C-alpha cells in the first residue's frame, strides 16, 4: 500500500509499505530515499508517537493515511 509521511516544512514522501511493516521498517525506508537517520526520526499519528516494536497494523494505519515526521 501507499502512505504519506508529512514533514513540518510541508514536504511529503509516499512510502510503499504493507500493513505488516514495523515502525522501524518505515523509518528505514525513509532513510533509503531521504537519507535521514532513523535515530533522528520521530513519527506521529493521532497525537501519538510510534514505537519501532509496534507495526503499522497496531496503530490502525490505512492506505493513503498520513503520518507526521519530526526531526530532532
Amino acid at each position: 500500500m501507499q502512505i504519506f509521511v508529512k514533514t513540518l516544512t510541508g514536504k511529503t514522501i509516499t512510502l510503499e509499505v504493507e500493513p505488516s511493516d514495523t515502525i522501524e521498517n518505515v523509518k528505514a525506508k525513509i532513510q533509503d530515499k531521504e537519507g535521514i537517520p532513523p535515530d533522528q526520526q520521530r513519527l506521529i499519528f493521532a497525537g501519538k508517537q510510534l514505537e519501532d516494536g509496534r507495526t503499522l497494523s497496531d496503530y490502525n494505519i490505512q492506505k493513503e493515511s498520513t503520518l507526521h515526521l519530526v526531526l530532532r
Binding site: 513540518l8 516544512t9 510541508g10 520521530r42 506521529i44 493521532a46 497525537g47 514505537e51 519530526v70
Partner: protein, 90 residues
C-alpha cells in the same frame, strides 16, 4: 548544521501538531514516548518563536510582513503556554 528560517506554514504545522498531542495526552496513559516527543515539539516551538523575532528585528520601516511574523509568534506563544498550564501547572 547552522541556523535557518522557518516558513509561516511550518510554524502552523508545529503549532497544530503540538495542539494535537496535548489533547491526546493523559498523565496516566501517556507513556514516556509521547511525553518526550512533546518536549521536542515544544523546544522547537521555542526555537521558532526566536527566529521569528530575529526576522522582526530586521524588519524595515513600513514592512509588509511584520504583522504576520508577530501573529505567528503569538500562536507559538499561545501553544507554548498550553504545554505549560497542562504538562506543568501554570
Amino acid at each position: 548544521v547552522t541556523k535557518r528560517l522557518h516558513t509561516l506554514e511550518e510554524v502552523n504545522n508545529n503549532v497544530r501538531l503540538l495542539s494535537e498531542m496535548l489533547l491526546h495526552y493523559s498523565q496516566e496513559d501517556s507513556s514516556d514516548g509521547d511525553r518526550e516527543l512533546m518536549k521536542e515539539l515544544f523546544d522547537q516551538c521555542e526555537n521558532k518563536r526566536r527566529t521569528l523575532f530575529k526576522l522582526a528585528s530586521e524588519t524595515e520601516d513600513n514592512d509588509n510582513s511584520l504583522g504576520d511574523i508577530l501573529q505567528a509568534s503569538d500562536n507559538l506563544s499561545r501553544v507554548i503556554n498550553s504545554y505549560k498550564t497542562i504538562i506543568e501547572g501554570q
